[model samples]
Target: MSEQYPVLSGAEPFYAENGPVGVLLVHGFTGTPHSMRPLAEAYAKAGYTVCLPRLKGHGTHYEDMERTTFHDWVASVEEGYGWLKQRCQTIFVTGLSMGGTLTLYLAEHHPDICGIVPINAAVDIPAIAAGMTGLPRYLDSIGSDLKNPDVKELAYEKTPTASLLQLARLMAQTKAKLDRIVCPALIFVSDEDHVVPPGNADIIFQGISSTEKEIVRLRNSYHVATLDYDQPMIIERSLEFFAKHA
Candidate 1:
């Protein structure tokens, strides 16, 4: 498949000076960096260095994701974070859904990270996997013909069993490592999320050890709140959260 977003091919050449505070934006499973492109662009416009890496096995065939493990996905974000660290003193990490799960993993491992923002982040995958299993197989089929013009249309049409199993493993690891996360956190949960239950947000909030935390409820958005009606508010709240902590 053709790339839908620009890759930061020249980022390394200009990685010497400390630009603005850095922000790492991660996309969900089966999602490309395109899912969080708007947020990356917003942070860039606001004078913050931003990094959005396409996770391993994503932005391609669904079968590719099946061959990869959750560790592979975590490594992709860690490499992005390492690059951002060289260019800024304070780095904030954020992700949507599974990306949020990865962000939490990074926060638990990287203590220097300044802040974290998890948008509809997942701490469990079985809930979604079990729910989607009830749908018709034809609806979950993958193909190049499908397209969504209103949004970025970046997602895996089909779920891979191996990938789902890896996700379950990651969730178990995340649950065990929550107390390791001490950075300030901001979590966004949509009241009408169809893909992930809003309860995932509560699970994250209750488990993390961050003394300073805030949870914003999106009333109108569905699963992809980043592209939903509440998108502007999401960006505004994110910017405000970063600014307050930075």
Candidate 2:
């Protein structure tokens, strides 16, 4: 399904070799690696090995996403984890939005994760994705939910309902297994998110059994905080998280 559509410019998966520590960066649903690229580069610049995986059904076309399920997305991140494990002595996982959902899911299944930082992750399926009959085949733009007027995320212009349902399943599936996560966690939430509700952050903060956890609030950014005004703060604070964990 993805082969038919060419990946958009600046939307390719990337890997950088640096040190023994590895960070696997995951982009969100309907979003491309472009959304996470800055953070990936920052981690690499800080001398950490990094891999940014482009999730299945993303970065190419929404039509490509129509045929993909959450399982496929999970497999994509698992592949990223495997790639990192081969080279690094320590590994940490972090993601945004649905990418965050997958981050938690990865932590749940893999107890070896050194730490995790999930930004605006979803735990409960959004109310809008009821999967009810009579809805359109696609929904209006859920992408580019950024506070920065100077930047734009390279996300799907329209979200496929089929993919939306898969996202719901992913959230429900990850939420049910949150108890399995024991790694140090750093959760980020925006005070003015237009996409995910603030409650999802609370659910994750309270759900995980990690003895070391902290919640960072983003005041100047929107849902896509990584690309908004708080991007620098995220990078600085997350670097601190990595240092403390490593």
- Per TM-score, the best of the predicted structures is 2
Error of 1 at 104 (Å): 0.7
What is candidate 1's local distance difference test score? 0.78
Task: Give the whole-model CA lDDT for all candidates, comma-separated.
Answer: 0.78, 0.90
Give the Cα error of residue 134 in candidate 2, in Å.
8.1
Q: Best-fitting candidate, measured by lDDT?
A: 2
Weakest 10 consecutive residues of candidate 2 by summed lDDT = 125-134
Clashes of 1: 0
Q: Write the per-residue lDDT of candidate 2 for residues 1-246, one digit (tens) a residue.
A: 454688899899999989999999999998989989999999999999999998888888888888898999999999999999999999999999988999999999998899999999989855655447447898887547788888977988998988878888889889999989999999999989887898898999989999999899999999898899999999999999998888
Candidate 1 structure quality by residue, lDDT tens digits, 1-246: 333443333221112223668889888877777667777777778878888888877876676677788989998899999989778888999998888999999999999999999999888756646755553322363332112236545677787766777888888898789989989999999887767678989988999999998899988777777767777888888889888888
Query: Which residue segments of model 2 deviate by more than 4 Å?
Result: 130-134
lDDT for 178 in candidate 1 is 92
